[PDB]
Amino acid sequence: SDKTFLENNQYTDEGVKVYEFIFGENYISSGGLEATKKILSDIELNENSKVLDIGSGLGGGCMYINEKYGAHTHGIDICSNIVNMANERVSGNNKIIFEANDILTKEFPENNFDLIYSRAAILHLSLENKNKLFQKCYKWLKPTGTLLITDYCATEKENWDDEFKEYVKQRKYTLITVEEYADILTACNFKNVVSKDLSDYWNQLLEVEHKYLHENKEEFLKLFSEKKFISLDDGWSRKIKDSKRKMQRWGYFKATKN
C-alpha cells in the first residue's frame, strides 16, 4: 500500500533516475555527496561501527559511510525496485547491506547500532508512524549510539498556500515543523537533541542543482523527455521559492540515547 504507492509513482525506476541526474550519482536527496560529507563531518565511526540507513535509496549514503569509516552499513528501503538498483552499484563488499523492507515492521536487536542515519525518508511517514519509528530507534541505538536525521519540514499547516497544500497532498508527505519534530525526539527520551533549520543551506543546494539542470538540458533531454524536464525544473523553482520564505523547510536532527 505505502510500498505500492511509492514504487508506482514518485519512486519508479525512471522517476529515480530523473532525481539522480540532478541530485548526483547514487543519491535521491539534496546536495548529494557534498551535503552528505558535511552532515557526517562531526560524526566519529570506525571499522567496528554498525550503521543503520533508514531509507537508503540508491545507497550513496552507505557507500560514503563505509568508505570514510570502514563501518558496517545496513540500509533499509521500502521500495524493492530501488534496492535492486542499489545492489547493482556495490560488489565485493560484505560490510554494505541493502534490504527491501518497511522500517516500521523491521525488527532489530535492542542496543545494536552506533549510528542510525536517515536522509529525506521519514517525511513519507504519518505523524503517528514518526513517533513509532523514533521509539524504535531509541531501542535500536546502543547506549553510546547517535541518531542523525535530515528531513523535509515546514511552517505551521495553518500558513500553507494552495500550491504547497497540493504538493504535500499529492506527495502524501506528512510535514511537521522543525520544532514539533524535535519535541517528538524529546518525548522519546532522546538526550542532547539538537535541531537545525537548514533551509538557507538547502536553498543554496537547490540553486546549484537548478543551475546544473539548465546547463545540462541537452544531456537531460537525450536521457528523458521535455515533460520530465519541465516537471523537474518547475519543482525546483517552487522549492527554491518556498525554502527562501521558510514555507517548506529542511530540518537537521542529531540526538543520543544517553
Ligand SMILES: Nc1ncnc2c1ncn2[C@@H]1O[C@H](CSCC[C@H](N)C(=O)O)[C@@H](O)[C@H]1O
Ligand atoms: N517506511 C519506509 N521504510 C523504509 N524506507 C522508506 C519508507 N518510506 C519511505 N522510504 C524511503 O525513503 C527514500 C526516500 S529518498 C532518499 C534516499 C537516500 N537516503 C538519499 O538521501 O539519497 C525512498 O527511497 C523511500 O523508499
